Amino acid sequence: AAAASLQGKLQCFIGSTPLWDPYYPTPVFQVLAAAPTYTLSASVTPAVVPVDTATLWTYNIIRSVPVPAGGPSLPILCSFWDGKTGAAPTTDAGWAALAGSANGKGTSMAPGSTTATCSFTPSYSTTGTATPTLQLIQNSFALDAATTVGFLSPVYTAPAFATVTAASYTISSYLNPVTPVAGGAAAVWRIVITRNAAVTASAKTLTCQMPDNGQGGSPADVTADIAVGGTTTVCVFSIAGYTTATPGPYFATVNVVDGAVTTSHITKNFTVLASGTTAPTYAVTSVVSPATPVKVSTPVTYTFTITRTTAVPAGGIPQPIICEFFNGEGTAPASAAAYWRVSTTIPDADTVVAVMAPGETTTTCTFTTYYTTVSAGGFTAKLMVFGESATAAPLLTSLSVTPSQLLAAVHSFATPMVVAAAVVAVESTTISPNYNPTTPYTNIPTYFTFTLLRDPPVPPSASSGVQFACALYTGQNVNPASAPSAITDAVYKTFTDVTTAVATDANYFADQQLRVVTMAPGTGRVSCTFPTLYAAAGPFSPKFFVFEYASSTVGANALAVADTVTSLTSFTTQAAPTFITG
Ligand SMILES: *[C@@H]1O[C@H](CO)[C@@H](O[C@@H]2O[C@H](CO)[C@@H](O)[C@H](O)[C@H]2NC(C)=O)[C@H](O)[C@H]1NC(C)=O
Secondary structure (H helix, E strand, O other): OOOOOOOOOOOOOOOOOEEEOOOOOOOOOOOOOOOEEEEEEEEEOOOOOEEEOOEEEEEEEEEEEOOOOOOOOOOEEEEEOOOOOOOOOOOOOHHHHOOOOOOEEEEEOOOOOOOOEEEOEOOOOOEEEOOEEEEEEEOOOOOOOOOOOOOOOEEOOOOEEEEEOOOOOEEEEEEEEOOOEOOOOEEEEEEEEOOOOOOOOOOOEEEEEEEEEHHHHHOOEEEEEOOOOOEEEEEEEEEEEOOOOOOOOEEEEEEEEOOEEEEEEEEEEOOOOOOOOOOOOEEEEEEEEOOOOOOOOOOOEEEEEHHHEEOOOOOOOOOOEEEEEEEEOOOOOOOOOOHHHOOOOOOOOOEEEEEEEOOOOEEEEEEOOOOOOOEEEOOOOOOEEEEEOOOOOOOOOOOOOOOOOOOOOOOEEOOEEEEEOOEEEEEEEEEEEOOOOOEEEEEOOEEEEEEEEOOOOOOOOOOOOOOEEEEEOOOOOOOOOOOOOOOOOOHHOOOOOOOOOOOOOOOOOEEEEEEEEOOOOOEEEEEEEEEEEEEOEEEEOOOEEEEEEEEEEEEEEEEOOOOOOOOOOEEEEEEOOOOOOO
8 A cells, every 4th residue: 555654663672572562663664656767967166167176066956756755754865976087886786885975965855855065076087078877876884786776767867967177288488597607507498387286197208399490400319208196397408519709698488298289388487698708607695584592482584695796687687586484493404406405395493495586686585584503603594596486496305316416515604603501480379278478378288379471481483491409498397207418400400200190199299399391382481280288387498499401401500500509488388277168
């Protein structure tokens, strides 16, 4: 019989006891006099998509008979074939197997509804038309790929093909040196080729040729490679033999081919200097702010002015500038070429991209650095300059092309930067609880919070925060059972570590304690809380010490003077009150 709402009854027994009493009702299921039909519509975005780019396919599914109101939402498994890669599965088992991966989506028809949506984002790899095929399965918790039957027969084919167009190429170029000298150093044309979409199958081999270098010559054809997932490649043309017989301005044509696709480009302008003339030479001047000396973590700004002997031609190609700056702290780069450090992104704290504009002589590279260690000898920061574009800079190492060494030797700052240690002081020593801000009660746990402020705050974006070991000797000679041998730095340094001590163990209330506190980056001060318990009332002289901390080892005194003691005001503990707030 055909009915609208129907309920089953499942009753199961372990041994003799039933899991549910009197039974477990099952969700409402509708009985249909005929097989429901599944109408379907498809939409594309964009209708025309470049190769190796995502395209949104949207399928709207409409069911002839609405899902029962009281029953559960109907699970639907959209197995979709983009129509361009491989072949569509021939059996429903193939669709079920394919739907496990990203090519198969899972939606749910809500109860009392007649519509559902399935969206996919395929990325085609070949040019031409693509017509997808989609099939619907049921996503029951126990879906057998073999015996399952899709509700859709025959497999729906979207009557709206997507047009996958071929890839495009944007071609830029620059020259090193920007004004080649005839018969001298060989000129190098660096050609940056950018693809409108990243390659996915494998590395692609662009073929770059230069029919004319402005002088009428034709250098040997070059092949450049673009790696998987990359959108940029560099083609290097080493031309030697430029001549000044033709009038000053010149321009070169370069065509780059990828199979059928051909893209032509013309370099803007450039001038070849007369043979025998002295090649233009670059120099660097350096300024610092503030002046020597500076403290640790103080923002130090270096400004380097790069000056060319002669101005760049007004109509020619502007010269890219890559400034790699080493602040002087740590291991210096091995040589000038070693300064081509691998940078994740171009505008980092060590690499700066500038442009010497045509008709201009000087440019400026600005760096901001923080000095961590202390060196009274002074740090001599250095700078190295290359001529490379920002786009081609990251991938020059991958393509095994030597960056253009734009300087004869590394520029070293004239005056070494003498760096002194930061100044840290104990701002306040609060007691909780306390009869007055100077003395605590007796026979109750009292906590001393010491606040330490560093005059130059730990800079944001620092690798790690600073660490301070704070040592305290309250007195009363109970838990250590003896006074410290001497007030010297070493004796208090040798104190036990209780940074992770809890109230259970006997070290929680120790007359001699040593704790570790980390000043986080972007903070100026830290606090250390020490628990104490004054069993007996009497005069007391708590002693406090601060030390630097590194690699879980206690360093020298943090107060910049050997054997510096922060002596709390002497006090006599008085009786505690018994009133309870509430
Ligand atoms: C880049 O060089 C080209 C080639 O010389 C310049 O185009 C022509 O240059 C000749 C040089 O004798 C002039 O007589 C023509 O008048 C130029 N043509 C045009 C349309 O201006 C071109 O001017 C140079 N580019 C710049 C920006 O100066």
